[PDB]
Amino acid sequence: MQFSKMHGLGNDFVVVDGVTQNVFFTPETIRRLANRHCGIGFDQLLIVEAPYDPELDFHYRIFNADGSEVSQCGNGARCFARFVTLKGLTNKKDISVSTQKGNMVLTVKDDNQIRVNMGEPIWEPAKIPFTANKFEKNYILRTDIQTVLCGAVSMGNPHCVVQVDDIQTANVEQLGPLLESHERFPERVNAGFMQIINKEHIKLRVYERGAGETQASGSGACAAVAVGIMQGLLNNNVQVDLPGGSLMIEWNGVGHPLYMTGEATHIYDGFITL
């Protein structure tokens, strides 16, 4: 079986052509392949497959090092696009792909960066979903240790965005879990902590819904920028610095879809039996 090793935003991936290859992985096998000393070594495994839908080009699955399938909105998108482009599985510049719990259109930029159309930000509290009497640019959320202000929005998934003075000292450790599992968020939520450097630059940390802090949250990045823009604190093109890497977010506001642009790097090609 053939595979490629890639990296993007602090995560290293094994990417597999599941279209021209028939591939199956047990959680077990995945755990073994992920092992850095006895296996290939990787944070995540990405499998490209047929979409079984005439209006899409591909579908792809993501698995964690534990061996279980995951559905982290937008991650692996850059590696996926670069991969199908490098492997010649397609030659289109605009690629439509489905994810376990989502959908998106990717654009292979001329400079070789990958631009993702994340759709239009969802503000309606009910549609996030988030419990509140009405829309607000800033909501008041109470926790056991502090009352915080936050912007709330949905990029398909739910997000909670809190601004902080210093990204490194933000109380992510305590506030993260408290917001992530907060009562007013029926289906839970992604908790973003954003430090605004200037109108086009932010530093961000995110406590992922049901996963805690990660090196990078694509959707988190989108959400934080959408909120900042909504509140008038940010311009329409913002550089976002996540722990694992940087992303460029572009959003022209209400009535417009939000774009997430970033890089993906091919490291090597591999061959492995079983």
Coordinates of N, CA, C and O in Angstrom, one line a residue, residues 165-260:
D165 N -5.9 39.6 27.1 CA -4.7 40.5 27.0 C -3.4 39.9 26.6 O -2.7 40.5 25.8
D166 N -3.1 38.7 27.1 CA -1.9 38.0 26.8 C -2.1 36.5 26.5 O -2.5 35.8 27.4
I167 N -2.0 36.1 25.3 CA -2.3 34.7 24.9 C -1.6 33.7 25.7 O -2.2 32.6 26.0
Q168 N -0.4 33.9 26.1 CA 0.4 32.9 26.9 C -0.1 32.8 28.4 O 0.0 31.7 28.9
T169 N -0.7 33.8 28.9 CA -1.2 33.7 30.3 C -2.7 33.6 30.4 O -3.2 33.4 31.5
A170 N -3.4 33.5 29.3 CA -4.8 33.3 29.4 C -5.1 32.1 30.1 O -4.4 31.0 29.9
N171 N -6.1 32.1 31.0 CA -6.5 30.9 31.7 C -7.2 29.8 30.9 O -8.3 29.4 31.3
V172 N -6.6 29.4 29.9 CA -7.2 28.3 29.0 C -7.4 27.0 29.8 O -8.4 26.4 29.7
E173 N -6.5 26.7 30.7 CA -6.5 25.5 31.5 C -7.8 25.3 32.3 O -8.3 24.2 32.4
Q174 N -8.3 26.4 32.9 CA -9.5 26.4 33.6 C -10.7 26.8 32.9 O -11.8 26.2 32.9
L175 N -10.6 28.0 32.2 CA -11.7 28.5 31.4 C -12.1 27.6 30.3 O -13.3 27.4 30.0
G176 N -11.2 27.0 29.6 CA -11.4 26.1 28.5 C -12.5 25.1 28.8 O -13.5 25.1 28.2
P177 N -12.2 24.2 29.8 CA -13.1 23.1 30.1 C -14.5 23.7 30.6 O -15.5 23.1 30.2
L178 N -14.5 24.8 31.3 CA -15.7 25.4 31.8 C -16.6 26.0 30.7 O -17.8 25.9 30.8
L179 N -16.0 26.5 29.6 CA -16.7 27.0 28.5 C -17.1 25.9 27.6 O -18.3 25.8 27.1
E180 N -16.2 25.0 27.3 CA -16.4 23.9 26.4 C -17.6 23.1 26.7 O -18.4 22.7 25.8
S181 N -17.8 22.8 28.0 CA -18.9 22.1 28.5 C -19.9 23.0 29.2 O -20.6 22.5 30.1
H182 N -20.1 24.2 28.8 CA -21.0 25.1 29.5 C -22.4 24.8 29.2 O -22.8 24.4 28.0
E183 N -23.3 25.1 30.1 CA -24.7 24.9 30.0 C -25.5 25.5 28.8 O -26.3 24.9 28.2
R184 N -25.1 26.7 28.5 CA -25.8 27.4 27.4 C -25.4 27.0 26.0 O -26.0 27.5 25.0
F185 N -24.5 26.0 25.9 CA -24.2 25.4 24.6 C -24.6 23.9 24.6 O -23.8 23.0 24.8
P186 N -25.9 23.7 24.3 CA -26.6 22.4 24.2 C -25.7 21.3 23.6 O -25.5 20.2 24.3
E187 N -25.0 21.5 22.5 CA -24.2 20.5 21.9 C -22.7 20.7 22.2 O -21.8 20.2 21.5
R188 N -22.4 21.5 23.3 CA -21.1 21.8 23.7 C -20.5 22.9 22.8 O -21.2 23.4 21.9
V189 N -19.2 23.2 22.9 CA -18.6 24.2 22.1 C -17.1 24.3 22.1 O -16.4 23.8 23.0
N190 N -16.6 24.9 21.0 CA -15.1 25.1 20.9 C -14.8 26.5 21.5 O -15.5 27.5 21.2
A191 N -13.9 26.5 22.5 CA -13.6 27.7 23.2 C -12.3 28.4 22.7 O -11.2 27.9 23.0
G192 N -12.4 29.5 22.0 CA -11.3 30.2 21.5 C -10.9 31.4 22.4 O -11.7 32.2 22.9
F193 N -9.6 31.5 22.6 CA -9.0 32.6 23.3 C -8.1 33.4 22.4 O -7.1 32.9 21.9
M194 N -8.6 34.6 22.1 CA -7.9 35.5 21.2 C -7.3 36.7 21.7 O -7.9 37.5 22.4
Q195 N -6.0 36.9 21.4 CA -5.3 38.1 21.7 C -5.2 38.9 20.4 O -4.6 38.4 19.4
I196 N -5.7 40.1 20.4 CA -5.6 40.9 19.2 C -4.3 41.8 19.3 O -4.0 42.6 20.2
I197 N -3.4 41.5 18.3 CA -2.1 42.2 18.1 C -2.4 43.6 17.4 O -1.8 44.6 17.8
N198 N -3.2 43.5 16.4 CA -3.6 44.6 15.6 C -4.8 44.2 14.8 O -5.2 43.0 14.8
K199 N -5.4 45.1 14.0 CA -6.5 44.8 13.2 C -6.4 43.7 12.1 O -7.4 43.3 11.6
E200 N -5.1 43.3 11.9 CA -4.9 42.2 10.9 C -4.1 41.1 11.4 O -3.5 40.3 10.6
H201 N -3.9 41.0 12.7 CA -3.1 40.0 13.3 C -3.6 39.6 14.7 O -3.7 40.4 15.6
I202 N -3.9 38.3 14.9 CA -4.2 37.8 16.2 C -3.5 36.6 16.6 O -3.0 35.8 15.7
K203 N -3.4 36.3 17.8 CA -2.8 35.1 18.3 C -4.0 34.4 19.0 O -4.8 35.0 19.7
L204 N -4.0 33.1 18.7 CA -5.1 32.3 19.2 C -4.8 31.0 19.8 O -3.9 30.3 19.4
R205 N -5.6 30.6 20.8 CA -5.6 29.3 21.4 C -6.9 28.8 21.5 O -7.9 29.6 21.8
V206 N -7.1 27.5 21.3 CA -8.4 26.9 21.3 C -8.6 25.6 22.0 O -7.8 24.7 21.8
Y207 N -9.6 25.6 22.9 CA -9.9 24.4 23.6 C -11.0 23.7 22.9 O -12.2 24.0 23.0
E208 N -10.6 22.7 22.0 CA -11.5 22.0 21.2 C -12.7 21.2 21.8 O -12.4 20.5 22.8
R209 N -13.9 21.3 21.3 CA -15.0 20.6 21.8 C -14.7 19.1 21.9 O -14.3 18.5 21.0
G210 N -14.8 18.6 23.2 CA -14.6 17.2 23.4 C -13.1 16.7 23.1 O -12.9 15.5 23.0
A211 N -12.2 17.7 23.0 CA -10.8 17.3 22.7 C -9.7 18.1 23.4 O -8.5 17.8 23.4
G212 N -10.1 19.2 24.0 CA -9.2 20.1 24.7 C -8.3 20.9 23.8 O -8.6 21.0 22.5
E213 N -7.2 21.5 24.3 CA -6.4 22.3 23.5 C -5.6 21.5 22.4 O -5.0 20.4 22.7
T214 N -5.5 22.1 21.2 CA -4.8 21.5 20.1 C -3.8 22.4 19.5 O -3.9 23.6 19.8
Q215 N -2.9 21.9 18.7 CA -1.9 22.8 18.0 C -2.5 23.7 17.0 O -2.0 24.8 16.7
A216 N -3.7 23.3 16.5 CA -4.4 24.1 15.5 C -5.8 23.8 15.2 O -6.2 22.6 15.0
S217 N -6.7 24.8 15.3 CA -8.1 24.6 14.9 C -8.5 25.6 13.8 O -8.7 26.8 14.0
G218 N -8.6 25.0 12.6 CA -8.9 25.7 11.5 C -10.2 26.5 11.7 O -10.3 27.7 11.6
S219 N -11.3 25.8 12.1 CA -12.5 26.4 12.3 C -12.4 27.4 13.4 O -13.2 28.4 13.4
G220 N -11.6 27.2 14.4 CA -11.4 28.1 15.5 C -10.9 29.4 15.0 O -11.4 30.5 15.3
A221 N -9.9 29.3 14.1 CA -9.3 30.5 13.5 C -10.4 31.3 12.8 O -10.4 32.5 12.9
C222 N -11.2 30.6 12.0 CA -12.3 31.3 11.3 C -13.2 32.0 12.2 O -13.6 33.2 12.0
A223 N -13.7 31.3 13.2 CA -14.6 31.8 14.2 C -14.1 33.1 14.9 O -14.8 34.0 15.0
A224 N -12.8 33.0 15.4 CA -12.2 34.1 16.0 C -12.2 35.4 15.2 O -12.5 36.5 15.6
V225 N -11.8 35.2 13.9 CA -11.8 36.3 13.0 C -13.2 36.9 12.7 O -13.4 38.1 12.6
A226 N -14.1 35.9 12.5 CA -15.5 36.4 12.2 C -16.0 37.2 13.4 O -16.7 38.3 13.1
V227 N -15.8 36.8 14.6 CA -16.2 37.5 15.8 C -15.6 38.9 15.9 O -16.3 39.9 16.1
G228 N -14.2 38.9 15.7 CA -13.5 40.1 15.8 C -14.0 41.1 14.7 O -14.1 42.4 15.0
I229 N -14.3 40.6 13.5 CA -14.8 41.5 12.5 C -16.2 42.0 12.8 O -16.4 43.2 12.7
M230 N -17.0 41.1 13.3 CA -18.4 41.4 13.7 C -18.4 42.6 14.7 O -19.2 43.5 14.7
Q231 N -17.4 42.5 15.7 CA -17.3 43.5 16.7 C -16.6 44.8 16.3 O -16.5 45.7 17.2
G232 N -16.1 44.8 15.1 CA -15.4 46.0 14.6 C -14.0 46.1 15.1 O -13.3 47.2 14.9
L233 N -13.4 45.1 15.7 CA -12.1 45.1 16.2 C -11.0 44.6 15.2 O -9.8 44.8 15.4
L234 N -11.5 44.0 14.1 CA -10.6 43.5 13.1 C -10.9 43.9 11.7 O -12.1 44.1 11.4
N235 N -9.9 43.9 10.8 CA -10.2 44.2 9.4 C -10.6 42.9 8.7 O -10.7 41.9 9.4
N236 N -10.8 43.0 7.4 CA -11.3 41.8 6.7 C -10.3 40.8 6.2 O -10.8 39.7 5.7
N237 N -9.1 41.0 6.4 CA -8.0 40.0 6.1 C -7.1 39.9 7.3 O -6.4 40.9 7.7
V238 N -7.2 38.8 8.0 CA -6.4 38.7 9.2 C -5.5 37.5 9.3 O -5.9 36.4 9.0
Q239 N -4.3 37.8 9.8 CA -3.4 36.7 10.0 C -3.6 36.1 11.4 O -3.6 36.8 12.4
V240 N -3.8 34.8 11.4 CA -4.1 34.1 12.7 C -2.9 33.2 13.1 O -2.6 32.3 12.3
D241 N -2.3 33.5 14.3 CA -1.2 32.7 14.7 C -1.7 31.6 15.7 O -2.0 32.0 16.9
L242 N -1.8 30.4 15.3 CA -2.2 29.3 16.2 C -0.9 28.7 16.8 O 0.2 29.2 16.5
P243 N -1.0 27.8 17.8 CA 0.2 27.3 18.4 C 1.1 26.6 17.3 O 2.3 26.8 17.2
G244 N 0.4 25.7 16.5 CA 1.1 24.9 15.5 C 1.4 25.7 14.2 O 2.3 25.2 13.4
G245 N 0.8 26.8 13.9 CA 1.1 27.5 12.7 C 0.1 28.7 12.5 O -0.8 29.0 13.3
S246 N 0.4 29.4 11.3 CA -0.4 30.5 11.0 C -1.4 30.3 9.8 O -1.2 29.4 8.9
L247 N -2.5 31.0 9.9 CA -3.5 30.9 8.8 C -4.0 32.3 8.4 O -4.0 33.3 9.3
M248 N -4.4 32.5 7.2 CA -4.9 33.7 6.8 C -6.4 33.7 6.6 O -6.9 32.8 5.8
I249 N -7.1 34.5 7.4 CA -8.6 34.5 7.2 C -9.1 35.7 6.5 O -8.7 36.8 6.7
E250 N -10.0 35.4 5.6 CA -10.6 36.5 4.8 C -12.1 36.5 4.8 O -12.7 35.4 4.5
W251 N -12.8 37.6 5.2 CA -14.2 37.6 5.3 C -14.7 39.0 5.0 O -14.4 40.0 5.8
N252 N -15.5 39.2 4.0 CA -16.1 40.5 3.7 C -17.4 40.9 4.4 O -18.0 41.9 4.1
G253 N -17.7 40.0 5.4 CA -18.9 40.3 6.2 C -20.2 39.7 5.8 O -20.2 38.7 4.9
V254 N -21.3 40.1 6.3 CA -22.6 39.6 6.1 C -22.9 39.5 4.6 O -22.8 40.5 3.8
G255 N -23.4 38.3 4.2 CA -23.7 38.0 2.8 C -22.6 37.4 2.1 O -22.7 36.9 0.9
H256 N -21.4 37.3 2.8 CA -20.2 36.7 2.1 C -19.7 35.5 2.8 O -19.8 35.4 4.1
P257 N -19.1 34.6 2.1 CA -18.6 33.3 2.7 C -17.2 33.7 3.3 O -16.6 34.7 2.8
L258 N -16.8 33.0 4.3 CA -15.5 33.2 4.9 C -14.4 32.3 4.4 O -14.6 31.1 4.2
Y259 N -13.2 32.8 4.1 CA -12.2 32.0 3.5 C -11.0 31.8 4.5 O -10.6 32.7 5.2
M260 N -10.5 30.6 4.4 CA -9.3 30.2 5.3 C -8.2 29.7 4.4 O -8.3 28.7 3.7

